[PDB]
Design a binder for this molecule. Sequence first.
Ligand SMILES: CC(C)Oc1ccc([C@@H](C)N)cc1
Lengths: 237, 300
Amino acid sequence: GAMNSSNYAELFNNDIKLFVDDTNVYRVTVHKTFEGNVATKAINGCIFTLNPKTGHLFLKIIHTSVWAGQKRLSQLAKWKTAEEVSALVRSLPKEEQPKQIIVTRKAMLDPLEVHMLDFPNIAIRPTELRLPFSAAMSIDKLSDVVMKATEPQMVLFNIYDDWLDRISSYTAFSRLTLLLRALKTNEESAKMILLSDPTITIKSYHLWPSFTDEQWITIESQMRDLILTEYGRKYNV
Amino acid sequence: MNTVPFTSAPIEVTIGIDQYSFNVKENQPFHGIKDIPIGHVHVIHFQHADNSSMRYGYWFDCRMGNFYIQYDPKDGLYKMMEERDGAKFENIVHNFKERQMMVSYPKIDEDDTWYNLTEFVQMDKIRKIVRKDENQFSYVDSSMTTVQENELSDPAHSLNYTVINFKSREAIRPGHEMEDFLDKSYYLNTVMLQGIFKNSSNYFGELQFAFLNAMFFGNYGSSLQWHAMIELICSSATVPKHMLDKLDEILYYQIKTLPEQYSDILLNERVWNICLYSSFQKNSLHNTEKIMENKYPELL
Ligand SMILES: CC(C)Oc1ccc([C@@H](C)N)cc1
């Protein structure tokens, strides 16, 4: 059934699974027209498809040309997501195909179920977790490749960098969700935290800074303080 | 006019014949039902006074044979049987008619309710949904499950309604996933009407039969089938104009005939609100929407 805090260790067992987040697929700017009406302009988007055990991220870039001449784009975006996830599964060797796909938004359930009819054994599950994957576009290297795309494109990343050499998947996912929650709550301050010290760099082949174990403890504590701070500023506590 | 005689009424029972129902007392002298209109299917149904568990009954057409009812004290139910001796039957019926031992089905210079509820229902199609090829009449009861219900356990006692499933490969063409899920016209018109039912009359026949089994026997799987067949039409953007007009008449009489006190269990809020207010055909069911709003404004 639905994924929640009670069955949370299931994410890090040995059954292949993917999270699918569709938040950033259909992205618009709302602006005024010369006549004083309101119009939207779409910008490139992406599907965020993540294996939480390995860190492997299948970032399918959604180029604005997809939407040309189409109606009801927010509905189309869910079906486009499901089409692309199904295409990804079919492209994978059988032993790499997931046994479960967890959608972060329940409106993806029926579109994905219908697109995956050929895969009766792949379970499509919602979750009651509020995961912060919408903030993927606050990661500079992911945002850069999406915005520069001139055509549909899939780009593969490891969202954990080399962390799994030193920590477990459970811990790596917790670090990731903390970083993304911080970037979602106050992007400027989170980015300031991550880049404050100029002697800590991002390897060309990585997404995050090369922190030592002790610096990650410092960073993580600073992220927790940020989230609680904003929770104070937000609710006056 | 035709007759269904009863050998006797050894146990106290409520007897239904089409939309009428009446009571007979334990060992009260009673030999059956006369003046049954020729040209329609009919259903004769039973609910025992001592155990209201299991409503059960028989679909039949008097043109297809001479049928009577006889209580079986071993299996504990009223059974329909066919009498092949035609002169014996006429003579039994004549003795019962002379002695005024049969209740009279209403005549009435005005009613069309039963016609309107069974317009497209044919015995031959009933006998393919209810498989018991040695009898010309068909038994249904409260507990019988449908083929689709069994997929999700005795196959010979099943209601073989046409399986409808909106998230199935039959319903969804490869490459037209969104199109076919949001607009069921290709499933309705190509797969079901052209492919399986052959015409809309057979579709409406199964829809009408499903409703009547839900209403008369409280058959839950029949209620599911009735709603699915309605939803498949209302969720199609492209439906022949004559089908929509006829569907409105069909549902009108079904809603008119439904007991007001059975609506809580016999009507599915989601399907009806979607069909009357959200679907492609939200503006095409004027008679049905008017009677639903005046009789069951709560559900909506
Ligand atoms: C012998 C005579 C025909 O028995 C009956 C008459 C009426 C009824 C119901 C209609 N009150 C039942 C049985």
